[PDB]
Design a binder for this molecule. Sequence first.
Ligand code: HDD
Ligand code: HDD
Ligand SMILES: *[C@@H]1O[C@H](CO)[C@@H](O[C@@H]2O[C@H](CO)[C@@H](O)[C@H](O)[C@H]2NC(C)=O)[C@H](O)[C@H]1NC(C)=O
Ligand SMILES: *[C@@H]1O[C@H](CO)[C@@H](O[C@@H]2O[C@H](CO)[C@@H](O)[C@H](O)[C@H]2NC(C)=O)[C@H](O)[C@H]1NC(C)=O
Ligand SMILES: *[C@@H]1O[C@H](CO)[C@@H](O[C@@H]2O[C@H](CO)[C@@H](O)[C@H](O)[C@H]2NC(C)=O)[C@H](O)[C@H]1NC(C)=O
Ligand SMILES: *[C@@H]1O[C@H](CO)[C@@H](O[C@@H]2O[C@H](CO)[C@@H](O)[C@H](O)[C@H]2NC(C)=O)[C@H](O)[C@H]1NC(C)=O
Ligand SMILES: *[C@@H]1O[C@H](CO)[C@@H](O[C@@H]2O[C@H](CO)[C@@H](O)[C@H](O)[C@H]2NC(C)=O)[C@H](O)[C@H]1NC(C)=O
Ligand SMILES: *[C@@H]1O[C@H](CO)[C@@H](O)[C@H](O)[C@H]1NC(C)=O
Ligand SMILES: [Ca+2]
Lengths: 669, 671, 356
Amino acid sequence: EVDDSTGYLTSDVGGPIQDQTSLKAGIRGPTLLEDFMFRQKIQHFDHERVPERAVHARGAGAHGTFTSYADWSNITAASFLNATGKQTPVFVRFSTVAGSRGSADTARDVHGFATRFYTDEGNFDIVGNNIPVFFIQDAIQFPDLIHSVKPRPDNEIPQAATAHDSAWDFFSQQPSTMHTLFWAMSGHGIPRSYRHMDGFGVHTFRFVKDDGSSKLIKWHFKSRQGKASLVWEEAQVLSGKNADFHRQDLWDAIESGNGPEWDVCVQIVDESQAQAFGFDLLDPTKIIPEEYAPLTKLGLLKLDRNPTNYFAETEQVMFQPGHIVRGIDFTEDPLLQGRLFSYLDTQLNRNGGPNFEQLPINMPRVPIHNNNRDGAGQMFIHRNKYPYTPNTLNSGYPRQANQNAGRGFFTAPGRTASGALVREVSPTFNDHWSQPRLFFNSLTPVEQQFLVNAMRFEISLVKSEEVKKNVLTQLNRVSHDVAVRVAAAIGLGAPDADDTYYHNNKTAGVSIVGSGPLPTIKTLRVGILATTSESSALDQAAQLRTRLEKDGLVVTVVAETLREGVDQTYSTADATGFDGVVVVDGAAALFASSPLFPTGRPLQIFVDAYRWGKPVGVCGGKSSEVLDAADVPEDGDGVYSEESVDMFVEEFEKGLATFRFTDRFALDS
Amino acid sequence: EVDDSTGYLTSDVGGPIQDQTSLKAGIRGPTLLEDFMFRQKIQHFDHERVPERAVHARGAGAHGTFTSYADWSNITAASFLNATGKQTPVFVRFSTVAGSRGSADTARDVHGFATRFYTDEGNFDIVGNNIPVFFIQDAIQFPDLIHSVKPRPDNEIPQAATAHDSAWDFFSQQPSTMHTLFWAMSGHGIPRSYRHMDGFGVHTFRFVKDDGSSKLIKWHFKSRQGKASLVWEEAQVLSGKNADFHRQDLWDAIESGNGPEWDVCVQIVDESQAQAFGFDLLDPTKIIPEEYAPLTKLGLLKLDRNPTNYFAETEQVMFQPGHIVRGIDFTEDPLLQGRLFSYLDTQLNRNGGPNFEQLPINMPRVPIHNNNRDGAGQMFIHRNKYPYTPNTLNSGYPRQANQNAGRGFFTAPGRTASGALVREVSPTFNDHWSQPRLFFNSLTPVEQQFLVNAMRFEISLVKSEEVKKNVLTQLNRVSHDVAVRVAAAIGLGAPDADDTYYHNNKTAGVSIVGSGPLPTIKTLRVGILATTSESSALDQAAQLRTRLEKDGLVVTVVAETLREGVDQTYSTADATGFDGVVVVDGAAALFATASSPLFPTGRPLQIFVDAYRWGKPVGVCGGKSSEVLDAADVPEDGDGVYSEESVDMFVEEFEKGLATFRFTDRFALDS
Amino acid sequence: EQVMFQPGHIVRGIDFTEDPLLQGRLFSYLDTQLNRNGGPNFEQLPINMPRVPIHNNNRDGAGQMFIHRNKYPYTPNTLNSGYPRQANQNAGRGFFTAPGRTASGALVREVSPTFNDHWSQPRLFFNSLTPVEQQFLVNAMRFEISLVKSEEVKKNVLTQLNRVSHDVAVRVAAAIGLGAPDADDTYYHNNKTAGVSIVGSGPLPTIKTLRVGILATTSESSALDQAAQLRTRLEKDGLVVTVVAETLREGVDQTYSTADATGFDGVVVVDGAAALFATASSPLFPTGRPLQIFVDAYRWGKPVGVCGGKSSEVLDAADVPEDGDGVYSEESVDMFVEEFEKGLATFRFTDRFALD
Ligand code: HDD
Ligand code: HDD
Ligand SMILES: *[C@@H]1O[C@H](CO)[C@@H](O[C@@H]2O[C@H](CO)[C@@H](O)[C@H](O)[C@H]2NC(C)=O)[C@H](O)[C@H]1NC(C)=O
Ligand SMILES: *[C@@H]1O[C@H](CO)[C@@H](O[C@@H]2O[C@H](CO)[C@@H](O)[C@H](O)[C@H]2NC(C)=O)[C@H](O)[C@H]1NC(C)=O
Ligand SMILES: *[C@@H]1O[C@H](CO)[C@@H](O[C@@H]2O[C@H](CO)[C@@H](O)[C@H](O)[C@H]2NC(C)=O)[C@H](O)[C@H]1NC(C)=O
Ligand SMILES: *[C@@H]1O[C@H](CO)[C@@H](O[C@@H]2O[C@H](CO)[C@@H](O)[C@H](O)[C@H]2NC(C)=O)[C@H](O)[C@H]1NC(C)=O
Ligand SMILES: *[C@@H]1O[C@H](CO)[C@@H](O[C@@H]2O[C@H](CO)[C@@H](O)[C@H](O)[C@H]2NC(C)=O)[C@H](O)[C@H]1NC(C)=O
Ligand SMILES: *[C@@H]1O[C@H](CO)[C@@H](O)[C@H](O)[C@H]1NC(C)=O
Ligand SMILES: [Ca+2]
């Protein structure tokens, strides 16, 4: 870390200098080439940018730690997992997928959840998503997926969105994508925060024990903050009002001592069970339903420290699935296999040089011993002048590490191969439709409506008639009902039911809206709509504040202008900034124009909050009546009307836990 | 151009190949290192991105042409300007300033307007903004301005916005910024499209004649589509609903044969007049008011062709003020001076190598003769095997070009220097406040309110009390009234009036809302809110369509679901998508506690009410039209509100509202 | 400088094998061009471009020189009618892996036992060289091993050499003053193979472009006339001729100052220059240079000769044996060339090199 809280400005080589005026040939003359102060400064500036990540360009990171719950030697040789209470430092970066680095956090997308464990046996990365399955079955297809999903190559439109022809052309032609597509079209596409989503490794990996035996595994990072998601119409506004929402949220949660947590869990099954669940475990488009393999809690992951310099830490972190440790191994998942190549190659693009692992954020916490040399930006000075193997002149050091010496990584010895070299897809990968259906069946009826609505939204933006038809064809193979309801919005006849893959199986744990109340409401945001006219209004506010802040909530008092007790103005305020909204009684005048905010804003905030399914309430005497003026039903679920401050809070806090009031949304017929 | 409409897939060296399945050791086996089809394709993918521009990362471009109105030999030796009707190909890129790639078009920012003329005497670049003055007086300060304005370096927040502590800390400590700050806080910060804004060179340059004499100049690109801007509350929504608004607009205008146009104009003054206007002309924080130097129309710029590949053309274009031609020269503007270094250096970052001028979009349209050799990505094979001067072995070729031979570029010979080498600011640069005031005085009273409101918005998001006070201090030096009104929103006492720079001077042409109606309404967007219940509703729509489309407008018919005659659904619709909004009579049911599973609650009315509140021409067309408005709470008699039965008379009335564009009577003023 | 080769640059008709060296190469040559070119579009350099059209979905990258018309660069698409099409064995003449190729067993980081004989083939190679060639090889090894500072390393080198040939180990060990270890005959044998010998591959099939230096002088007017006549003959047979003298002038290509034996395949002294080869010095070239060139040429095994009357005697002064193989003594210009040209074809006269 470099401290600049005191001292005189120096060049990068420590020579004291100024940087405020150019060296000129006369007070009104031209600038001089010999002005080294100018050029060193501007050169640095001109070269500040690096290429954004090819995918997941928009994201944010935090430091934390992982704690093991046990000695897991019975399932894996992995050292960071070899003792109860063992702590390993971590760094995590969350992201969206499609958008470039300045795009909104709250676009509809799949989300990245990438974790580095700086273990005492090397860095170990789990590079996953908030959705357990992926669009495609072979890495070689990744540029096709990503080209079709990103903006059109002629005009670069649209940013951060699947709502255009190419995306759906691809989805409709590459049916493997149905499963992920359904997830992304659910609320999983628009989480309330990084903290309210899970992480998944997606691929099956292997645990490997010192004796050489292997089990097949799936990583799950379960959120201890519960699952929550925005509603579309809300997300769209939020993208404009606050592109930085998710990163703001994570930053704040950590500043206030509410670091988010996850249980790091696995599903463990046998090599013999590769095809025992009615799909191939090498297929990254499938889940093992919890019904057939329960989760084992391995340890706790917690984030509790923000970075100091975003660029130096978050922007420069370079994850790789290739960062593997003794005790884990890969599987023959053709998607995973390709990823191994990509992540090592791409860092050359980003770093401009081969020494990227020497950046502080990428360095390990243990010594490095190898014969890698030179390259641009070489930061070490190697003492071993015989960097070859085998050597005698350095006494055969460094020594080869493997299964039986030096705790080397080793491939699971059980793994075997047979048959011809082929560029052909396994027939076992052919069912693209059942699991999407399983997924859809497992959502609450409102969740289903939302998903249909998300699909109606996007497909209606697809200009091409032929593509729309091909979309309906694919959707229909998952559910006729879905096809029918989606088709209705774009004015086409859904094709005739095809029941090859229809079924009524459900799975637990994939639903957001059906996952019951939040286990905590700490850090949720409450907006209090007040006024500077009635002296009573601000007193009501102040009292609500003390009560609510006591329960870990984040409170904002809104008024026409700022002053003691007021956090922000009606001008800068919006419903998307709050998880629940409270009008204090004394502000009724405002809800029934001003040069200090746009017309109708105070009521707009409240009405929006209500329509998006948020806990809304009026606190005070004439509360009975402020609602009929607002057109909000007094008896309605999650609408709160009370005089007793202590009782209002108590009631409201139950609404914040329910989080979304789903009775306010129309269903199909 | 590379065609891929037919054929089999090939590697980059032309070997026919496949790219859909990896090569595996057995059908359920691991992928093989020897799979070159895989690796070549993924390597390419892994290396697609290049660093975004250090500033102006978010932008869009188009191809067009420039036509000269005359032989301008009397003022400049510049060849692209030497004949009536002379045609030079151009490429233009517009942009914001602070946002990264992917940030919304409709953030509040200064805007870039960068023009390449591919002249028959070399490439000539005018790299300017939609605002005629800049924040700072010395290029060496650029990183300070930019650091403070971009996201905070600890958490990278907020994207594309000056609404945070550091920016205002900077503005308040660096008063030179007041002028540009006022412009950015006006509607100039949020133009309706790239087409509805002007371009300015900002700096004073020199025109130079073959005899060696020079005049001082200022470039102005005046928009033939007129000036128009969004209102804040609308821009915020738009940023979410359509980050791509400006680029979609420009793309569309060009596809439909409505290429935007600008008059390329200059102010021309004498070297003797450097300090004759009460400010130094080397100061990029000042304008020459039109009152003291009228504009001369030099020629016409028109954009009429979209690029084929965005990355290859728009992303790769690399502008440079250093791209100068015979007939123009620089001035000692310490901001311009530094720019010269930066734009050449930064392309190394962006291109990763020194041969960036060899990219098709950066190539000139004339031959190249010099001794530059090698470098990564060298695309030429040079025949001259004696690339030094002086040589005899290539008969002294290429020959030196200068004033008197080969039509060489040459520095204005009049230019002189004297005094000491100094890192000192000229005292003539010291008035940071008069011109901002001049600018403010020149805006309509509503425009002034909007500007106060923009400042109220931002300053209220500045967390630090001290910084807020210093902002008020600076604002006060421009106008006590402004300070008072702004201070009111953040609950502080404006400091006591300081009249050193107060005055009542006005200047013409800087006002948007006061620039009268638009000269054309072609390409403006009209949304027609209909329904699929009443068969009458869609028929009303269809008839409005034929009538409105005939006048060059872009028409969207909105209903619950899609079908013949319906362009989009209520679900995907929003007021920000339209310049005016029309409800057809037969849809009254939808605007009256009714809900649908096909769109969010209250959407149809929300669109209309939004349109009205943002100052747009709104109307109901049909019989019961009188009554649909009272339900909507929109005043029937109000300016730009339209109520008629006669389709022909409705259009005629509505089209007048579109030209007025914004109805300013709906916005509250201070007291 | 910019040409960038790749074994991955393969065509329909050829395929790789499971050679663990070849396999790795495939990765390395694609990766390294990123280093050299600084960017992913190296195949767009003129020298690396193919002569046929390119159809694929690769896009962007720094230094992108194309402007692609296909705005749907993904597969599968319908929006560009499923183009470009997949090419394979049965369509579009696609590359394809040999279908016979199969795999079996475990994933292993182990060396095949079939790779374990490191010594027979070197021996085969050595046995197939002429005895002088063998001496030269021993001598190269003597040269290098004696520059190896470490005693232990020298011993380990002898160990390995010995396993190929005890003779070789003994001869090499002689120069570095160590005892070769005891014969180990596991891989010894007397098999020979054809075509791996240079010195034993008989005369050259052509002598066109070989370089002949003619050592003359500007004192005797006769010397330059002899030269000029040798030139016309020799140049007629496609040789490249350099006439060397003290200074330049018409008919002289280079000076003794800039001249050296390494610059010539054979060397001829014209009779009229005898004075130069006999304690005589000049400020125009270093002491002894003219003779040094000749003596060097002879000692390196090159065809050397004197052309003229007093040719019999210039050699005894030079200490070059008149009767020696590839030494040429004649008065008749036509018969000198004819004899010399045979020496040029033999190229190296191996009888001048001592054996063990
Ligand atoms: C072979 C191509 C390829 C394929 C099939 C995938 N990825 Fe990837 N991924 C990349 C190639 C890639 C990359 C282009 O190499 C990136 C971009 C920046 C980087 O360092 O790696 C990357 C970025 C990246 C990031 C951002 C890391 C960060 O925050 O810096 C995450 C979280 C993932 N990926 C996760 C996945 C998951 C869960 C996949 C499905 C199993 C997946 N990727 C398939
Ligand atoms: C000393 C540094 C410096 C200063 C004082 C300025 N600029 Fe700049 N500008 C750059 C350094 C720079 C740059 C970093 O070199 C850029 C970024 C990307 C590029 O190629 O050049 C650039 C980009 C850039 C672009 C984008 C062109 C495109 O679309 O590719 C425009 C329109 C401008 N500038 C205009 C201006 C104006 C009107 C200025 C005030 C008079 C100005 N710049 C001051
Ligand atoms: C591997 O060892 C761990 C270490 O205790 C086992 O975890 C415990 O399992 C028993 C049930 O078998 C429970 O009563 C404990 O509460 C578990 N503790 C924890 C922290 O999980 C684990 O079961 C063993 N697994 C196998 C496959 O042998
Ligand atoms: C858990 O973690 C580390 C894995 O390296 C182990 O501690 C190491 O143990 C070996 C002894 O075999 C030492 O040579 C290393 O130097 C130790 N390293 C550190 C960092 O302490 C430990 O053995 C493992 N525990 C179990 C129960 O397997
Ligand atoms: C729906 O659920 C049933 C019940 O588990 C599944 O049928 C079983 O599948 C497993 C795995 O293939 C088999 O071992 C059993 O023989 C089946 N059991 C019974 C009781 O029928 C079925 O596979 C599921 N279908 C889908 C499409 O998910
Ligand atoms: C430079 O020459 C041009 C060439 O015509 C002059 O422009 C015209 O000026 C005349 C006479 O005042 C006007 O009637 C026209 O409006 C101009 N024509 C066009 C097409 O612009 C210009 O005035 C000359 N300027 C100077 C300083 O000599
Ligand atoms: C306008 O500019 C063009 C470009 O310089 C001039 O045409 C050139 O004239 C020179 C002679 O001075 C010729 O050698 C070139 O062949 C011409 N260039 C081209 C591209 O054709 C033209 O003469 C200029 N007109 C005036 C009035 O100066
Ligand atoms: C204001 O305008 C008048 C007339 O243009 C001019 O004389 C005066 O100097 C101006 N003063 C300032 C401060 O702009
Ligand atoms: Ca580079």
